[PDB]
Amino acid sequence: SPPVCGNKILEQGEDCDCGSPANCQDRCCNAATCKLTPGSQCNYGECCDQCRFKKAGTVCRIARGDWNDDYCTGKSSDCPWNH
Numbered sequence: 001s002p003p004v005c006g007n008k009i010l011e012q013g014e015d016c017d018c019g020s021p022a023n024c025q026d027r028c029c030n031a032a033t034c035k036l037t038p039g040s041q042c043n044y045g046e047c048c049d050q051c052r053f054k055k056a057g058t059v060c061r062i063a064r065g066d067w068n069d070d071y072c073t074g075k076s077s078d079c080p081w082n083h
Contacts, residue, residue, distance in 0.1 A: 008031075018030065045076070046078060047076055058071065
């Protein structure tokens with residue numbers, strides 16, 4: 001699944017796109033923008049939860065025990081170990 005904006009593949013650095021703006025069957029992902037539609041923050045990823053990123057502080061990972069603890073940032077679908 002290469003990076004094609006307008007192919008229904010969230011690969012073309014879109015983070016939310018549909019094959020065709022007219023057939024965009026993703027209320028959370030818009031092709032015309034190749035990004036999360038207005039109102040949604042997530043769509044795919046660890047931080048993604050209900051088309052909305054997990055409020056910063058939501059533990060989603062762990063390095064190797066419990067020091068810094070991996071926590072969401074409520075800004076992306078990624079969860080940094082916090083290291």
